[PDB]
Amino acid sequence: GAQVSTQKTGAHEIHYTNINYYKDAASNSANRQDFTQDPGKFTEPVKDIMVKSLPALN
């Protein structure tokens, strides 16, 4: 019941092993490898989006 995933290494130059030992999901370690984002709801939060080259309020 083991899982292999890559480590945090640098660029231009791994595979640790994790096994969960407790019956609850609240005992698991922190999920410190989710690097995704979406700033489309804080920047650009408008209706009728703008095209960055047009005067846009033309």
Binding site: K41, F42, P45, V46, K47, D48, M50, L57, N58
Partner: protein, 252 residues
Amino acid sequence: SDRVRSITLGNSTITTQESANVVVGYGVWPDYLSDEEATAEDQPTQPDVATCRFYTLDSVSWMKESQGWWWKFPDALRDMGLFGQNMQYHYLGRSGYTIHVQCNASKFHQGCLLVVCVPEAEMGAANINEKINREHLSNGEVANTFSGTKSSNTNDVQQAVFNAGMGVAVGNLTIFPHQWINLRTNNCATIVMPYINSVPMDNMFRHYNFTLMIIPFAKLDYAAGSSTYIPITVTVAPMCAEYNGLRLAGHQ
């Protein structure tokens, strides 16, 4: 051009000619509550024409020395028709909103408003270990007013513009869904606001969902012959309003 915008919600229509755009929340448009996120078990009430329509609040006058205004918004529409009555007869309410603010001038006036829509604006007190009365956080459709200096009234909010009544920097207050009313380009500011709360439905008297704030950064200024009285008029329309738990009228 895209500066002309028209909005129809029910039997009320707003046509503007110098609009800018429409900010829609955090990208989410107001919709009804699904059966997966629902908690209560009984049938809700969806009026959808007698409720979802524009209600016009009081106009406030903007002098050169005005500092700001705020309205609490499930509470400023307490006595506005069947929205207020359906608030008084039900226990659980859930709605989105559309906040349109009018302010007009000429090409000889200058100034700049900031229209912010702040969720969970838990405000401070004037005296630190003191209780705030409910007539000072909200007053219905009559606006409360910020002050320029440190206010120290009894049972009142700390009214200072450089802390917005909440204890933060007022320049950093643009993280919320906002627009500007700049008097050389704008005429109005439309903000579509969905339902943001930690629970799927909530009571509409015990809770304050959000707080509209209009704060002038660039002060109003004009010459010795221009018009002095410049009003600011706020109009609000609930969206996707539904209601649950019918019982007798009251709030206690």
